[PDB]
Design a protein around this ligand. Structure first.
Ligand SMILES: *[C@@H]1O[C@H](CO)[C@@H](O[C@@H]2O[C@H](CO)[C@@H](O)[C@H](O)[C@H]2NC(C)=O)[C@H](O)[C@H]1NC(C)=O
Ligand SMILES: *[C@@H]1O[C@H](CO)[C@@H](O[C@@H]2O[C@H](CO)[C@@H](O)[C@H](O)[C@H]2NC(C)=O)[C@H](O)[C@H]1NC(C)=O
Ligand SMILES: *[C@@H]1O[C@H](CO)[C@@H](O[C@@H]2O[C@H](CO)[C@@H](O)[C@H](O)[C@H]2NC(C)=O)[C@H](O)[C@H]1NC(C)=O
Ligand SMILES: *[C@@H]1O[C@H](CO)[C@@H](O[C@@H]2O[C@H](CO)[C@@H](O)[C@H](O)[C@H]2NC(C)=O)[C@H](O)[C@H]1NC(C)=O
Ligand SMILES: *[C@@H]1O[C@H](CO)[C@@H](O)[C@H](O)[C@H]1NC(C)=O
Ligand SMILES: *[C@@H]1O[C@H](CO)[C@@H](O)[C@H](O)[C@H]1NC(C)=O
Ligand SMILES: *[C@@H]1O[C@H](CO)[C@@H](O)[C@H](O)[C@H]1NC(C)=O
Lengths: 216, 226, 75, 49
């Protein structure tokens, strides 16, 4: 999870239904009503700061080259697909389907709309595929993807010649691996439970709040 | 050259701190939230809480106990909730600071006391060293980091055939300026002539994709030739 | 001078096409700032400069120089 | 949540933008790279190991 629904309940309208008599009575209790309002705003503003930290880690927006020649690897699924209206890649779409009053509570919209977020994850994905780790440290440096994977083996203690000799085999394992991700996400929703709980706990918490109005 | 870049780098930090206070906002915010919350706590004292008067002495003085109780009990309940709210405010805010403290302690150990290879855990770019500086209720780190500066285009290839035996870099990359083949360290361009001291043989040519023909030099041969 | 956004009715600000770096957040991707004679402008947020990478299967970029940058982190 | 967000932010920097030698910090097995994918109110990582 990265963020939760930005919710704001107006303290006054909730307690008093636009009754001046009720409002004046409330002013006796002092600044309770303004603290409770401000504390929830602090959560709301912090909430946008989360998605900034997670995604806006790249200073530029890199774009993948038009021709998808990556040494045999197949990022067609995770790369953005221009055909769909929102620039969302195929796996990103499967997730969005899996995840599923007027008493003074308002739901402020998020600052980074879902199209914009998908732009960053396009960028971070494109930067990784064409620059390795370099684009993180500074200016992005193009490296053919075959070697970049070959470096990463050299990181984990396997000498380079293993990969180049086995480039064809590794690609097929990688491509089939991504394919297996689709089916697990496509069919079973239990994997995506953690995101759903944040929605369920939050949405439930409001229902308890609203139901309290009907208590004597 | 590095010393001049480092010394000038420190100089800029002063001016960024000397003239612009936006940098120290995060520490400043903690002071305000606590001081502001305390002001609210004291302000609640002057709220009558649905009683005849907020001042205790008045309801104490003007009325004798039997009616005073019902008035005071409203004040006490009102004040007590106000104090109850303030503490729960502190406890929650206390947790956030601790999560920041442990994060600082982790940086102090893994970033100052040692070089850390965690990417962007210690400021953008490769990390060299860190210096700590104290601050009001806070710690401020100077992260000295290495950043590649002027990139350059080179044609490259995975390996070189010399005698049918494929040659890979021991370290670094195989780059060509267009007419000759060199091996250079990954993060800085200091091309050297390709030798068996820089490369280790494996397999034969056919398997590796993209391999390019060239000549690999052997230091031993001209010595035996001589 | 009324402009309608998903955040709500926005009044007294000039909508513009060209985007800039976000300065004051409205939500739903609209950010407003003070700009040139000067007025208040509301614009679609700009996510950053676009930069395609000249990728090809046999091209590599090697830095030839370095800058030792010192940055500040406050906790 | 904010505790989870920072953990994600740390994961994004140390696991996507770079290779990490921290064991199991990036999925079981030796780590090679990570790809991020957006999700409703969250981020989903593909760890290639
Ligand atoms: C990358 O893999 C995808 C598989 O998801 C390939 O796309 C399929 O290509 C076949 C024929 O090549 C079509 O019959 C399918 O309909 C395609 N599926 C989708 C979802 O587009 C793609 O061709 C591969 N790319 C490369 C360069 O091999
Ligand atoms: C690529 O680099 C090589 C090595 O520096 C260059 O070859 C040398 O060129 C100089 C002239 O600039 C000659 O004096 C040397 O005798 C050459 N060395 C060898 C071993 O032939 C080459 O000219 C460079 N090519 C390009 C296009 O920059
Ligand atoms: C690298 O050099 C070798 C020769 O050492 C080339 O191999 C030739 O390949 C053709 C095509 O099959 C054959 O007809 C020749 O008989 C091969 N030569 C020998 C000596 O067997 C190879 O094509 C060269 N490759 C590059 C990229 O330069
Ligand atoms: C690497 O970059 C540095 C820039 O920091 C270069 O140093 C500069 O060189 C110019 C000469 O044209 C001087 O006028 C500057 O004063 C130098 N900068 C500093 C901070 O002293 C350096 O020459 C570059 N190295 C190479 C090999 O190109
Ligand atoms: C390398 O070549 C590409 C080809 O388009 C060019 O855009 C890029 O600027 C070149 N790199 C440098 C450092 O000039
Ligand atoms: C690299 O791509 C070019 C396309 O311009 C192709 O002709 C060539 O065979 C490719 N080589 C390798 C080693 O992938
Ligand atoms: C944006 O551009 C279109 C034409 O490209 C123009 O009709 C429209 O008025 C512009 N928007 C603003 C706010 O000027």
């Amino acid at each position: 999870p990265v963020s939760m629904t930005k919710t704001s309940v107006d303290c006054t309208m909730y307690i008093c239904g636009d009754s001046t008599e009720c409002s004046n009575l409330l002013l006796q209790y002092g600044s309770f009503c303004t603290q409770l309002n401000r504390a929830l705003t602090g959560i709301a503003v912090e909430q946008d700061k989360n998605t900034q930290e997670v995604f806006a880690q790249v200073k530029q927006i890199y774009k993948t080259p038009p021709i998808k020649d990556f040494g045999g690897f197949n990022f067609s699924q995770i790369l953005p697909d221009p055909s769909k209206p929102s620039k969302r890649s195929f796996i990103e779409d499967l997730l969005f389907n899996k995840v599923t009053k007027f008493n003074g509570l308002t739901v402020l919209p998020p600052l980074l709309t879902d199209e914009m977020i998908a732009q960053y994850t396009s960028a971070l994905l494109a930067g990784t595929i064409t620059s390795g780790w370099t684009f993180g440290a500074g200016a992005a440096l193009q490296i053919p993807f075959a070697m970049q994977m070959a470096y990463r083996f050299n990181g984990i203690g396997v000498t380079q010649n293993v990969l180049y000799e086995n480039q064809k085999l590794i690609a097929n394992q990688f491509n089939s691996a991504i394919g297996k991700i689709q089916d697990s996400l496509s069919s079973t929703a239990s994997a995506l439970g953690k995101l759903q709980d944040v929605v369920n706990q939050n949405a439930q918490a409001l229902n308890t709040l609203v139901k309290q109005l009907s208590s004597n | 050259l590095i010393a001049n870049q480092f010394n000038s780098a420190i100089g800029k930090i002063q001016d960024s701190l000397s003239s612009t206070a936006s940098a120290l906002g995060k520490l400043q915010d903690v002071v305000n939230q606590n001081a502001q919350a305390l002001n609210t706590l004291v302000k609640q004292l002057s709220s009558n809480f649905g009683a005849i008067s907020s001042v205790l002495n008045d309801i104490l003085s003007r009325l004798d106990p039997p009616e005073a109780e019902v008035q005071i009990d409203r004040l006490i309940t009102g004040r007590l909730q106000s104090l109850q709210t303030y503490v729960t405010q502190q406890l929650i805010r206390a947790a956030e600071i601790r999560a920041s403290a442990n994060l600082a302690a982790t940086k102090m150990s893994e970033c100052v006391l040692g070089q850390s290879k965690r990417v962007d855990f210690c400021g953008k770019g490769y990390h060299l060293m860190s210096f700590p500086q104290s601050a009001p209720h806070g710690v401020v780190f100077l992260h000295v980091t290495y950043v590649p500066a002027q990139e350059k285009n080179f044609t490259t290839a995975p390996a070189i055939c010399h005698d049918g035996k494929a040659h890979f870099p021991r370290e670094g990359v195989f780059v060509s300026n267009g007419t000759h083949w060199f091996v250079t360290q990954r993060n800085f361009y200091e091309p050297q002539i390709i030798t068996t001291d820089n490369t280790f043989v494996s397999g034969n040519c056919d398997v590796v994709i993209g391999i390019v023909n060239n000549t690999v030099y052997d230091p031993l041969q001209p010595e035996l030739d001589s | 001078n009324v402009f309608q956004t998903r955040a709500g009715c926005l009044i007294g600000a000039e909508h513009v096409n060209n985007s800039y770096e976000c300065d004051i957040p409205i939500g739903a991707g609209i950010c407003a700032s003070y700009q040139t004679s000067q007025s208040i402008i509301a614009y679609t947020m700009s996510l950053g400069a676009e930069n395609s990478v000249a990728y090809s299967n046999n091209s590599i970029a090697i830095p030839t120089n370095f800058t030792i940058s010192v940055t500040t982190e406050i906790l």
